[PDB]
Design a protein around this ligand. Structure first.
Ligand SMILES: O=P(O)(O)O[C@H]1[C@H](O)[C@@H](OP(=O)(O)O)[C@H](OP(=O)(O)O)[C@@H](OP(=O)(O)O)[C@H]1O
Ligand SMILES: O=P(O)(O)O[C@H]1[C@H](O)[C@@H](OP(=O)(O)O)[C@H](OP(=O)(O)O)[C@@H](OP(=O)(O)O)[C@H]1O
Ligand SMILES: O=P(O)(O)O[C@H]1[C@H](O)[C@@H](OP(=O)(O)O)[C@H](OP(=O)(O)O)[C@@H](OP(=O)(O)O)[C@H]1O
Ligand SMILES: O=P(O)(O)O[C@H]1[C@H](O)[C@@H](OP(=O)(O)O)[C@H](OP(=O)(O)O)[C@@H](OP(=O)(O)O)[C@H]1O
Ligand SMILES: O=P(O)(O)O[C@H]1[C@H](O)[C@@H](OP(=O)(O)O)[C@H](OP(=O)(O)O)[C@@H](OP(=O)(O)O)[C@H]1O
Ligand SMILES: O=P(O)(O)O[C@H]1[C@H](O)[C@@H](OP(=O)(O)O)[C@H](OP(=O)(O)O)[C@@H](OP(=O)(O)O)[C@H]1O
Ligand SMILES: O=P(O)(O)O[C@H]1[C@H](O)[C@@H](OP(=O)(O)O)[C@H](OP(=O)(O)O)[C@@H](OP(=O)(O)O)[C@H]1O
Ligand SMILES: O=P(O)(O)O[C@H]1[C@H](O)[C@@H](OP(=O)(O)O)[C@H](OP(=O)(O)O)[C@@H](OP(=O)(O)O)[C@H]1O
Ligand SMILES: [Zn+2]
Ligand SMILES: [Zn+2]
Ligand SMILES: [Zn+2]
Ligand SMILES: [Zn+2]
Lengths: 161, 166, 166, 161
């Protein structure tokens, strides 16, 4: 696999451990045909750091936008550009795979749109793409959209494409 | 005072101490009417880290571009030939140097784009317009390996070898 | 047209022909709005001799100083340390070079004083202000021994390596 | 002898030969303690050329200004400076020695004044300094001043110093 894309995004903790707090971390994301991985970004060194997470491309069932946070904190609100682009991430999309939704934030709409599009392309021949989905965040216990109670609850909404 | 400009640049060590190496560091630069200061940038928290150095604006005697290194490493190479990168290159690739000269020596700063460099040179020009020690002559090339490439002078604060006139 | 400026300078051969040597000649330069021309100076008769070359003012893309030779011979050395001479030095010693860049290459001209150079650069700037091919980048150092000292480019008309900005 | 001074001047033919025309030539002049010499100036080469004339310092009886030409031609009339200084010479002085008066022109008063002064100094202990002299040119036959008829005619005027 060669790198399809590469960007720096903010991403919310997946809280796969009961202990994990709910938090956001900046990460460098790489997209190949087989995986969507993310890493610590070594800023000084100007490089990729330690791998923090991964998702097998074929286990993704749904990549979509998400309903924006009610009151983004600065960090996620809407040429200080050079800096704003790696400090402000206000455009969320979601990557849904077996475990649930991975929440990613783009510092821009274009970047965001760019990412979804290659994402779609990559999973296009998957076998479990779902045609139902949640346009919002799962949080504090439930899917803000359908109000359901399980990260893995069926999409309360329709996706055709 | 208000921050007039703020950016992330790559700068070369001023090697003020004898034991210091010649290396390059990424820093957050801010400019006010008092100083041009630079800090460690705390990427993770997205904020300004500890102050690494500064120059009092009234001590600056000259601000210009510098003739490029003849064989820069990739971190300082002009974009080659073959946008997502943009977000990243703009904090990794610094091909456009400028020099802020002041009583001590030149400070060498590298910009990610030409636009940024032009911007900063202009503002720096503005804040220095009425300084008392502006020089009319400068060294267009780096000081390096013990002397200026341009004229071979050894002293970092050797009078400039080139005049700029219109 | 009227002569805007007229002086005696020392210039380097442009070596347009392969067989040409790299040497320096004293010439009478005149500037009009049409051309910058240079002639043999007939000292004896105190007059302008035969035309040796010229450049059409509308073809000029840049006029600046040049970083000095690192080891000039005496004819091009800055006055050292220890007026009667003045009459003479001013036609023998040419330490202050400038470059007139145009589509073909740079023409290198050396002035006897700094005042003269400033003068000529200014007027040349005036006559070129609205030209169509002004460049924003130049080579601050001479072209020599096959390439520019500044950036090592070989082609005499290599795009400049340095930008001038305010 | 070391060079006391060195300048480029215009000087009139001494016409020491019946054939010689009356003419002006630019020359480089050098002043030492023993001699006042003059040469062809090699402009291209930027050097002294062939020696054209000389005057033994001790044979000089009188160095003085001269009465300016009635209608100097341009060349001798009163920052084109760099050039004017080696093209216009409108300040005459005279160097009188056995043979008569050598006529020199300065492109300036200062230069002129400078030259007379070192000249005076150099001949100060000569034994035939004359205290009579002609303030004008000898020409077309006679000393315009005293109207006399011999280049070597006694000074029609007084010089004390
Ligand atoms: O660093 P602290 O403050 O502990 O918090 C971590 C980070 O947010 C992790 O992100 P990253 O892996 O990007 O560093 C997140 O992992 P994921 O979100 O990747 O799973 C962890 O939750 P768990 O998911 O429970 O591991 C959470 O515990
Ligand atoms: O000593 P102070 O002034 O606090 O700041 C240090 C230096 O900048 C270190 O430089 P170096 O170690 O290069 O001298 C840097 O190490 P890095 O080399 O990692 O950048 C440290 O950051 P971290 O090391 O990232 O904590 C940073 O805290
Ligand atoms: O990080 P290490 O390897 O220690 O090297 C350092 C950094 O390049 C410093 O930069 P910064 O201050 O930006 O970290 C530089 O200070 P300046 O370039 O600011 O002066 C120090 O030189 P001295 O100048 O000798 O301190 C130099 O020794
Ligand atoms: O334990 P590993 O897997 O190496 O990675 C750690 C965690 O990402 C830390 O997270 P946290 O400390 O948030 O839990 C981070 O500290 P920061 O909080 O400073 O980002 C460390 O930064 P460095 O140690 O400085 O690389 C980084 O090395
Ligand atoms: O006098 P010699 O030894 O023959 O050498 C000449 C002079 O330097 C010419 O200068 P100028 O014309 O002023 O005499 C120069 O022309 P330019 O410098 O004008 O071009 C000729 O080069 P070419 O350029 O190759 O002609 C060069 O061969
Ligand atoms: O005969 P020698 O003693 O060498 O010197 C001559 C005469 O001065 C000539 O005088 P004129 O010709 O006036 O009689 C001069 O010619 P110009 O008239 O050209 O000045 C010659 O110039 P060059 O030959 O070019 O040096 C110069 O060499
Ligand atoms: O070159 P042409 O046209 O023949 O005329 C010469 C020059 O004027 C000589 O000047 P210079 O010697 O400066 O070249 C002058 O000599 P002086 O004035 O030195 O004596 C000659 O007269 P005579 O003086 O007659 O030789 C006169 O014949
Ligand atoms: O061939 P044209 O175009 O007429 O002009 C020539 C060249 O400029 C000669 O250059 P070079 O001989 O160096 O090529 C110069 O010789 P100099 O070398 O003496 O300057 C000649 O003057 P005189 O030589 O002074 O006549 C002058 O007349
Ligand atoms: Zn839902
Ligand atoms: Zn220099
Ligand atoms: Zn160059
Ligand atoms: Zn008389």
């Amino acid at each position: 696999a060669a790198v399809i894309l590469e960007s720096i995004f903010l991403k919310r903790s997946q809280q796969k451990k009961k202990t994990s707090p709910l938090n956001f971390k900046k990460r460098l994301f790489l997209l190949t045909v087989h995986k969507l991985s993310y890493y610590k970004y070594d800023f000084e060194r100007g490089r990729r750091g330690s791998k923090k997470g991964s998702i097998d491309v074929e286990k993704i069932t749904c990549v979509e936008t998400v309903v924006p946070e009610k009151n983004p904190p600065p960090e996620r609100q809407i040429e200080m550009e050079q800096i704003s682009i790696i400090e402000r991430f206000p455009y969320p999309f979601q990557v849904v795979y077996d475990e649930g939704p991975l929440y990613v934030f783009s510092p821009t709409e274009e970047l965001r749109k760019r990412w979804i599009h290659q994402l779609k392309n990559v999973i296009r021949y998957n076998s479990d793409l779902v045609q139902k989905y949640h346009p919002c965040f799962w949080i504090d216990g439930q899917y803000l959209c359908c109000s359901q109670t399980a990260k893995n609850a069926m999409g309360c909404q329709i996706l055709e494409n």
